[PDB]
Write a protein that binds this DNA or RNA. Structure first.
Ligand SMILES: [Zn+2]
Lengths: 72, 257, 15, 82, 116, 97, 296, 66, 49, 125, 260, 52, 194
RNA sequence: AUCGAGAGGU
């Protein structure tokens, strides 16, 4: 059960940088993401996505894993 | 491409490609170096050699028939005489293809349609389905490029016949009305001999139907004859791509009975 | 296409 | 059903279009299931193309058992068919 | 749903901008494929090439409107190469556009001064 | 004459009255337009915002036709039109039409 | 226009039912490997598909030249009299003037040609129709030979009459549809290829092959081989579903028929209606009566 | 609905002329004269002012409040 | 709606009658099985109560 | 040294027909000694030929010579696709320049060199 | 070469291009209509929208609004970069402009929201809506009634009309040549008289009419083109022309660099 | 025709009337299909109606 | 999309502003329709509408297209010519790709078009595998429910006339409701198989 | 899910 699925994300790098969306599905490498505009649906590498937290911050992918591990 | 139902092709050149191949193969269609040399890139399996121009001076030019013949495979022979006099038609009718080269004749449904004994049937039978497919592709691509850069259109001005032609149509219809009037008068005085095995009412109805049909056809003939060869409706009719004489007559002269 | 049956020719499979 | 002698065969000596389609399909299906290929491969990956090139060299090891309406049949090699 | 992204008209996605190959069927003939380019460049390039005497053949095509690119086939005389004539035509066009630019700017300044 | 017609154009229905110059067409074309005008997208009611219909299709920027029939005033097609005035060229351009 | 729309909406269903009925009646009729057309019960429907055993796809219209020629013109175009005629050697590299055996071959040729013309004019096409779909476009193959070999009309040919006769006879012997050493197999083969043989003999008469086409040995051999190959390509393949193909070929044009004539008449024919809308007779009178109005 | 920002064909900005167009009409100007005064020369750009229907105003009448 | 059989092929009820002038729309009628059976009142046609 | 000149004559134009096409016209012409008849389709737009105009017509098998090509005012490249010999010694030759038809009818003596092959037509006014 | 400017307006330039091939004139027209960069609202983040206008309706309307794009090709902070090329996480002053629309109708009447109601983040004169009408409002965005609110943030990026017609700085390019058809590049359609049935253009007075008796000139080519470039407002017409000529040059230069 | 002239004459009449129906419009169907229909309808000695 | 004259079509291709034919004013059409649609259908009302709409867009007066009026095409032509246009509605257009002036003059003008409720995305459907009916165990019906397409009687007939026995076997057995049973060789009835 | 009715598409 991936922790990324259902998480709001924006596209970091690439031609579609700056678009908001929600990760509907996730493979090991890429995440299948539901963009909010134009009923669009894309596949974007997990490393290419800024993730939105509860406080409105945008975090990197590695930051997301480090947050999900819960070690502290 | 060729079906067993009528032992003839079921596929052919249609609509824009047909109209544009009628316009492309006209005698006075001259292509300049630029146009021929852009078209060559659309010829499938082009061997890389420019066909020699048919006019060398004062201006270097190719013809539509010459360029179109590059799409017909070598070893295709086709004769189609519309008149049985000479191979020197002043009107460029008929069709002569020798070893894949068009000698004379405008290319139409009579040549590239799904007609029996035409270019498609000949190419299929002689060369094979694959080479016939190649012919389809090549002719479509070449004529589509040329027509894209030539343009073909139609408007409300092509349904209009000049004033004299409308006088002709009006006089035809007036004479038909007159004839029907004396027919009614005669039928009202038992002066109309019933046709064998036909009651008087039926015979009168048939007579008036013939008169009115003939009036419509005469008006349509006048309208079509008045129309020019630059007329878009007549261009489409001559190509065989869409329409016919009935449509021209109904749009221009008289809808009829 | 099914108006006949296909068999192996073992004489050819030897060679 | 009685097999007809090779000399007594009366059917056409040519491969019918239906026979050609069936033979190519059957050989391609067998190749796709790892049947040894009886022709040199130049890097072809489609079993149907491999079967086609086997046919061109008459290297398909198959027979056609053509049945006559009464039940007697003739076996024709794909190699000997024209 | 099956729409292509319009940025695909401007992004190479790893494709090379220019591809140059030698046409084997014909001597001294080359095919140049330009990706994410259209009639704007191709038309003027082919016309400039045909202003040149060393150019026997110069044509271009867009194989499909749904792919943004165009092919340009050029054949030259035996003493020259297609690549050299293409480069010379491109340089000549650059210079020509430069005079167009300079003269436009000069005329615009004169006209505006006239307005005042 | 015992009577006289107020206007012949009144022999037409709702949708046949939206066709411009229906008397210059072949009649099955008039029938086809009468059938297809029902499926045209426009604004069906002004209160479609507050209506929770099962299905609704709304045109962004509906325009009233440039060529209109006098019967349109009573059908209120200008008020709630279902189309747009497009610049149309009748041309063979690339063979994709 | 309303009538037109109604006619469309009714004719569609009428023809759909007609086509389903047609296909169901002939779905099982197939060409067998012995050349016969039989249904699923083995009952013979035809002894040779189309009575000639050819695929309808591969046939093309050919004109029978000898049919409409007069006896004088037929003689002129086909009769060779070396005793009276010397122009033949003008067209040939080898002199055959006053040759006995060659004249005997020409006489046998002309007797066969006259028999073929009699059979055409009296038994096959008494109405005088000449254009009929046959296998192989022989005229097109002849044109291909003229073009391919650059045949100069002014160059005498090396073809002897015996070469032409032997080549045409061997070709005709190689147009095998039915195979077997029996007697009725020979009869059916001859019947199946009879019309094609007549056309071939009218096309490749020695007088035509020499004085008209100016063929040479290489061109003639190429024509013979090409005709043989094309004919062997026209033979209907065993296992073809000729019944369903015929059903579809008849039904498809019915969808464009005029809804007695048209779909109603087709429905009357197909159901074998004992009572039809327009019973009629076509009584033909005697030749002397039919040529006068009063006796009629 | 509301007047489009740009023309569909010419791409000219017409979304800043609807009020001016209506005001011109109020001043006893024909629609043709008003379009002329707005500098709309291309008939493609003219058709969109001519044939625009303002459904926004009717949609604003269903205000949940008064 | 005319409750005639929509499968039975009776062209006469489907046809446009002379008396339909001014009462029913000559053009507006569906294409298909209900052609001519489903009709639409003209603009000024009044049905008595 | 002009073995390639299959024909060389002078022709006077008697009629011109420009009713069917806008860019092509059919000219009828007669030789100086009324022993040939020519009907030629020409691109009248780039090379008009009025009625009663004299012009030298040449038919060659190639353009190797520079002087023949340079002097010619109009050059076409066609194929001789039809030849017939009349029963009265006359020969008629029909040529097709990519669709533009030429019919030259004359004496066998001087039309004997026109065979069914590609040829060049050179007009010079 | 040469250029003659016949007229200059606030929104268009009408000139004559001479001593040029038709291919170059057409490429100038195409590049001016297709490939000149411009700044336009691209991404809309909507917090409150209680108007009758759907959200994407509003977004599309906002994207259509022309923003000042002059000097958008100069290096930042004078111009902009494509956000795809820029190194910012999502956007920044180098590759974007921020606009804000916060409107609320508390009165009784109807509140008309125009382009002047957009608030632009101050980093340059780039991205500022063009207010060209006499009242300096710009395009009418929306209309509201009492208690209806809009609150949204727009991110305007760089682009060209190939990706979306909103990035186009020109409305239409008038383009004519050979007003007398001396070259017969078109076969005029007519019923009785083509000359009488086809109106003469205004550019016909800038060329000498055909001389009676002159032979058809079959070697001549079109070398005089009457062009008119009309701007949307974002870029002045002269800058549009200069930028088109720069873009064509740069395409050719990329070709040369890649081949060499 | 079947009761008067027999079954072969019936097959010929079937063929003629089928061709009259089909070719009235100007269309053409190959003789093989009409002949096969007639032979199926006459194979068993009487007219087999194409119906249930 | 459709006109008000029975002229229905689908979009086959879209071209951008630069690639479409233009007039000397720079007018680019929104829609390009084929000439061949006009002659056979004889929808002259479409052409009269286009000419009248052009006149009304130029003059601003609304166009009366009411039937049975004295509005003739000649009067509309005179009105159109009064605006400096070719009276019959033709315009010299230039090629977008090359800027060259088309040999033919185009019939160009405004026409009222309608977007129809038939959108391609509402219709596009593809099935590989999915739900089957409970009773017959065949692909269910309907796009909305992930159903298969019907291989009917006429399609079976077409594949029979083709002679493709394996195509029929695949379509009707391997791709729809393949099933296996065990039969008793003595009584020929389905057996109890574990 | 099933059944029935209706509106439509080619
Ligand atoms: Zn940035």
């Amino acid at each position: 059960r991936d922790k990324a699925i259902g998480a709001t994300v924006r596209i970091r790098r690439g031609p579609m940088k700056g678009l908001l969306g929600v990760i509907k599905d996730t493979t090991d490498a890429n995440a299948r993401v539901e963009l909010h505009t134009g009923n669009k649906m894309v596949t974007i590498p997990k490393e290419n996505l800024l993730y939105t937290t509860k406080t409105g911050e945008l975090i990197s992918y590695t930051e997301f894993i480090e947050r999900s591990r819960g070690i502290r | 491409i060729v079906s067993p139902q009528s032992n003839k092709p079921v596929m052919g050149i249609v609509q824009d490609t047909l109209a544009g191949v009628r316009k492309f193969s006209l005698r006075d269609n001259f292509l300049t170096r630029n146009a021929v040399m852009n078209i060559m890139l659309w010829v499938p399996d082009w061997d890389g050699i420019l066909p020699p121009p048919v006019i060398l001076k004062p201006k270097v030019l190719w013809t539509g028939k010459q360029i179109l013949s590059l799409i017909i495979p070598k070893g295709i022979n086709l004769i189609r005489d519309d008149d049985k006099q000479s191979l020197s038609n002043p009107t460029d009718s008929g069709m002569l293809i020798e070893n894949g080269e068009i000698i004379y004749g405008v290319v139409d449904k009579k040549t590239v349609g799904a007609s029996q004994g035409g270019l498609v049937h000949t190419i299929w039978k002689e060369k094979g389905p694959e080479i016939c497919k190649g012919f389809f592709n090549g002719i479509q691509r070449v004529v589509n490029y040329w027509l894209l850069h030539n343009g073909f259109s139609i408007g409300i001005g092509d349904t209009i016949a000049d004033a004299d032609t409308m006088k002709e149509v009006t006089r035809t219809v007036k004479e038909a009305r007159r004839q029907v009037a004396e027919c009614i008068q005669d039928a009202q005085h038992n002066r109309l001999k019933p046709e064998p095995g036909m009651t008087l009412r039926e015979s009168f109805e048939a007579k008036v139907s013939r008169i009115l049909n003939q009036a419509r056809d005469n008006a349509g003939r006048s309208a079509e004859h008045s129309l020019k060869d630059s007329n878009n409706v007549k261009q489409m009719v001559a190509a065989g791509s869409k329409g016919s004489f009935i449509n021209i007559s109904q749009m221009s002269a008289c809808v009829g009975q | 296409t099914g108006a006949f049956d296909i068999y192996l020719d073992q004489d050819m499979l030897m060679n | 059903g009685k097999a007809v002698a090779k000399e007594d065969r009366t059917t056409t000596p040519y491969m019918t279009k239906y026979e050609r389609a069936r033979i190519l399909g059957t050989r391609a299906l067998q190749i796709s299931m790892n049947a040894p290929v009886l022709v040199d491969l130049e890097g072809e990956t489609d079993p149907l193309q491999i079967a086609m090139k086997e046919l061109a060299q008459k290297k398909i090891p198959l027979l056609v058992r053509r049945y006559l309406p009464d039940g007697s049949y003739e076996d024709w090699s794909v190699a000997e068919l024209i | 749903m099956n729409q292509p992204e319009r940025y695909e008209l401007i992004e190479l996605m790893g494709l090379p901008k220019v591809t140059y190959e030698l046409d084997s069927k014909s001597p001294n003939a080359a095919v140049v494929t330009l990706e994410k380019e259209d009639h704007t460049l191709a038309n003027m390039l082919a016309n400039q090439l045909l202003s040149d005497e060393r150019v026997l053949f110069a044509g271009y095509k867009v194989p499909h409107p749904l792919n943004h690119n165009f092919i340009l086939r050029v054949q030259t005389v035996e003493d020259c190469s297609p690549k050299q004539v293409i480069v010379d035509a491109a340089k000549s066009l650059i210079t020509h556009l430069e005079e167009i630019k300079v003269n436009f700017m000069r005329e615009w300044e004169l006209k505006m001064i006239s307005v005042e | 004459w015992t009577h006289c017609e107020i206007h012949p154009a009144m022999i037409l229905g709702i949708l046949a009255s939206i066709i411009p110059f229906p008397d210059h067409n072949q009649s099955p074309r008039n029938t086809y337009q009468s059938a297809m005008g029902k499926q045209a997208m426009g604004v069906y009611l002004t209160n479609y915002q507050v209506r929770m219909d099962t299905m609704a299709n709304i045109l962004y920027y509906p325009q009233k036709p440039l060529a209109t029939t006098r019967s349109m005033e009573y059908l209120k097609f200008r008020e709630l039109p279902a189309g747009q005035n497009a610049i149309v060229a009748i041309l063979c351009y690339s063979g994709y039409n | 226009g309303r009538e037109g729309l109604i006619d469309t909406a009714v004719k569609t269903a009428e023809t759909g039912y007609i086509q389903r009925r047609l296909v169901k009646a002939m779905e099982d009729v197939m060409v067998r490997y012995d050349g016969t057309v039989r249904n699923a019960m083995g009952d013979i429907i035809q002894f040779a598909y189309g009575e000639d055993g050819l695929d309808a796809t591969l046939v093309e219209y050919q004109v029978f030249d000898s049919l409409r020629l007069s006896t004088k013109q037929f003689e002129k175009k086909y009769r060779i009299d070396l005793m009276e005629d010397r122009s033949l050697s003008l067209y040939m590299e080898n002199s055959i003037e006053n040759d006995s055996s060659v004249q005997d071959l020409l006489d046998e040729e002309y007797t066969q040609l006259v028999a073929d013309r009699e059979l055409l004019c009296k038994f096959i096409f008494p109405k005088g129709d000449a254009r009929w779909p046959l296998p192989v476009n022989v005229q097109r193959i002849i044109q291909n030979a003229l073009q391919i070999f650059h045949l100069e009309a002014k160059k005498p040919t090396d073809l002897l009459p015996s070469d032409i006769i032997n080549g045409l006879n061997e070709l005709i012997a190689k147009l095998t549809i039915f195979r077997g050493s029996d007697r009725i197999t020979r009869d059916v083969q001859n019947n199946a290829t009879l019309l094609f043989q007549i056309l071939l003999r009218s096309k490749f008469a020695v007088k035509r092959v020499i004085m008209e086409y100016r063929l040479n040995k290489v061109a003639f051999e190429w024509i013979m081989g090409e005709v043989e190959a094309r004919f062997q390509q026209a033979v209907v393949s065993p296992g073809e579903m000729v019944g369903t193909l015929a059903a579809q070929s008849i039904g498809e044009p019915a969808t464009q028929m005029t809804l007695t004539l048209g779909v109603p008449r087709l429905k009357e024919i197909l159901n074998v209606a004992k009572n039809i809308k327009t019973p009629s007779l076509t009584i033909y009178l005697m030749p002397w009566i039919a040529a006068n109005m009063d006796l009629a | 609905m509301i007047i489009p920002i740009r023309c569909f064909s010419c791409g000219k900005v017409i979304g800043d002329k609807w009020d001016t167009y209506l005001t011109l009409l109020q001043e006893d100007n024909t629609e043709g004269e008003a379009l002329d005064k707005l500098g709309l020369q291309r008939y493609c750009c003219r058709r969109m002012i001519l044939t625009h229907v303002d459904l926004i105003e009717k949609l604003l009448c269903y205000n949940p409040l008064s | 709606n005319t409750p005639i059989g929509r499968d039975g092929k009776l062209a006469k009820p489907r046809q446009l009658h002379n008396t339909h002038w001014g009462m029913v729309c000559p053009a507006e009628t569906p294409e298909g099985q209900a052609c001519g059976l489903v009709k639409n009142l003209s603009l000024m046609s009044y049905v008595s109560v | 040294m002009s073995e390639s000149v299959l024909l060389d004559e002078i022709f006077t134009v008697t009629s011109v027909d420009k009713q069917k096409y806008q860019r092509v016209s059919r000219i009828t012409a007669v030789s100086g000694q009324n022993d040939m008849n020519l009907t030629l389709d020409i691109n009248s737009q780039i090379y008009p030929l009025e009625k009663d105009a004299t012009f030298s017509l040449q038919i060659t098998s190639n353009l190797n010579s520079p002087d023949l090509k340079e002097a010619a005012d109009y050059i076409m490249y066609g194929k001789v696709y039809r030849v017939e010999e009349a029963k009265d010694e006359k020969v008629s030759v029909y040529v097709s320049f990519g669709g533009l038809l030429m019919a030259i009818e004359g004496s066998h003596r001087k039309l004997y060199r026109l065979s069914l092959d590609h040829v060049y037509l050179l007009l010079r006014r | 070469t040469h250029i003659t400017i016949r007229n200059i307006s606030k929104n268009s330039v009408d000139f004559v291009l001479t001593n040029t091939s038709l291919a170059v004139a057409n490429s100038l027209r195409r590049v001016v209509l297709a490939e000149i960069p411009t700044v336009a609202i691209d991404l809309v983040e909507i917090n409150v929208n209680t108007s009758v206008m759907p959200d994407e309706f509003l977004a599309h309307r906002l994207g259509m609004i022309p923003l000042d794009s002059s000097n958008i090709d100069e290096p930042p902070p004078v111009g902009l970069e494509y956000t795809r090329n820029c190194d910012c996480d999502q956007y920044c002053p180098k590759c974007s402009v921020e606009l804000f629309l916060n409107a609320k109708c508390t009165g009784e009447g109807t509140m008309e929201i125009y382009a002047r109601d957009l608030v632009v983040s101050s980093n340059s004169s780039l991205g500022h809506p063009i207010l060209a009408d006499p009242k300096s409002r710009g395009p009418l965005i929306c209309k509201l009634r009492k208690e209806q609110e809009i609150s949204l943030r727009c991110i305007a990026k760089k682009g060209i009309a190939k990706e979306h017609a909103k990035w186009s700085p020109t409305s239409a390019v008038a383009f004519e040549y050979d007003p007398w058809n001396k070259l017969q590049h078109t076969d005029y359609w007519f019923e009785n008289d083509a000359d009488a049935e086809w109106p003469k253009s205004k550019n016909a007075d800038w060329e000498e009419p055909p001389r009676e008796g002159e032979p058809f000139n079959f070697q001549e080519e079109p070398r005089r083109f009457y062009m008119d470039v009309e701007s949307v407002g974002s870029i002045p017409p002269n800058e549009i022309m200069v930028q088109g000529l720069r873009i064509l040059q740069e395409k050719l230069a990329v070709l040369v660099r890649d081949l060499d | 025709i079947l009761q008067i002239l027999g079954i072969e004459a019936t097959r010929s009449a079937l063929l003629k009337e089928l061709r009259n129906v089909i070719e009235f419009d100007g269309s053409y169907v190959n003789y093989r299909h009409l002949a096969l229909l007639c032979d199926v309808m006459t194979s068993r000695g009487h007219l087999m109606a194409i119906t249930r | 999309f459709a006109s008000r004259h029975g002229q229905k079509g689908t979009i086959g291709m879209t071209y951008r502003h630069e690639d479409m034919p233009f007039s000397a004013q720079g007018i680019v059409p929104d829609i390009i329709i084929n000439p061949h649609a006009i002659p056979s259908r004889m929808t002259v009302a479409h052409l009269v509408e286009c000419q009248l709409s052009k006149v009304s867009a130029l003059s601003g007066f609304e166009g009366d297209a009411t039937p049975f009026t004295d509005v003739t095409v000649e009067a509309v032509s005179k009105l159109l010519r009064s605006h400096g246009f070719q009276s019959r509605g033709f315009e010299v257009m230039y090629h977008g790709h090359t800027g060259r002036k088309l040999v033919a003059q185009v019939f160009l003008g405004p026409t009222y078009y309608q977007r129809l409720k038939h959108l391609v995305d509402d219709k596009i459907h593809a099935r590989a595998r999915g739900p089957v009916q409970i009773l017959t165990r065949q692909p269910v019906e309907g796009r909305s429910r992930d159903g298969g397409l019907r291989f009917g009687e006429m399609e079976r007939d077409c594949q029979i006339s083709h002679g493709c026995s394996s195509v029929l076997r695949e379509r009707l057995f391997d791709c729809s409701d393949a099933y296996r049973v065990i039969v008793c060789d003595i009584c020929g009835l389905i057996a109890i198989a574990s």
